[PDB]
């Protein structure tokens, strides 16, 4: 599924991401936009044998099990395929563990490169939240 901008903002706010760990909703919407362009089916294979899954591109080497990532850990206790659903619940709950893993939102490279330090409030414009 491909979320509209405000549609996702609403979904994320509903799942408690607004200001979670001090990160405004705009930050998460911005991360989702540049990580997967709001596409729940987005996947990106990495050169280390791992793959990033879903709207928030969660990595298989440590967070989910796709059964084909060497020395992979499954800290979120879920199959990576669950991260490719139209329901973002799985990705949000896993994301909540990632942003609390000692690096803030820096865990998401697209967020760091395209969102960090910017006026992320713009990503929520026009949204009736």
UniProtKB/Swiss-Prot annotation:
Disulfide bonds join 6-127, 30-115, 64-80, 76-94. It catalyses: Hydrolysis of (1->4)-beta-linkages between N-acetylmuramic acid and N-acetyl-D-glucosamine residues in a peptidoglycan and between N-acetyl-D-glucosamine residues in chitodextrins. SMART domains: LYZ1. It is found in: Secreted. The keyword Secreted applies. Its EC number is 3.2.1.17. It comes from the Eukaryota. One of its GO terms (molecular function) is identical protein binding. The active site is at 35, 52. Keywords: Allergen, Antimicrobial, Bacteriolytic enzyme, Disulfide bond, Glycosidase, Hydrolase, Secreted, Signal. Lysozymes have primarily a bacteriolytic function; those in tissues and body fluids are associated with the monocyte-macrophage system and enhance the activity of immunoagents. Has bacteriolytic activity against M.luteus. Monomer. Belongs to the glycosyl hydrolase 22 family. This is Lysozyme C.
């Amino acid at each position: 599924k491909v979320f509209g901008r405000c549609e996702l903002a609403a979904a994320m706010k509903r799942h408690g991401l607004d200001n979670y760990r001090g990160y405004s909703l705009g930050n998460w919407v911005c991360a989702a936009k540049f990580e997967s362009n709001f596409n729940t089916q987005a996947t990106n294979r990495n050169t280390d044998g791992s793959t990033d899954y879903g709207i928030l591109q969660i990595n298989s080497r440590w967070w989910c099990n796709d059964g084909r990532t060497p020395g992979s850990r499954n800290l979120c206790n879920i199959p990576c395929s669950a991260l490719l659903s139209s329901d973002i619940t799985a990705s949000v709950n896993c994301a909540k563990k990632i942003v609390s893993d000692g690096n803030g939102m820096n865990a998401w490279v697209a967020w760091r490169n395209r969102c960090k330090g910017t006026d992320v409030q713009a990503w929520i414009r026009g949204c009736r939240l």
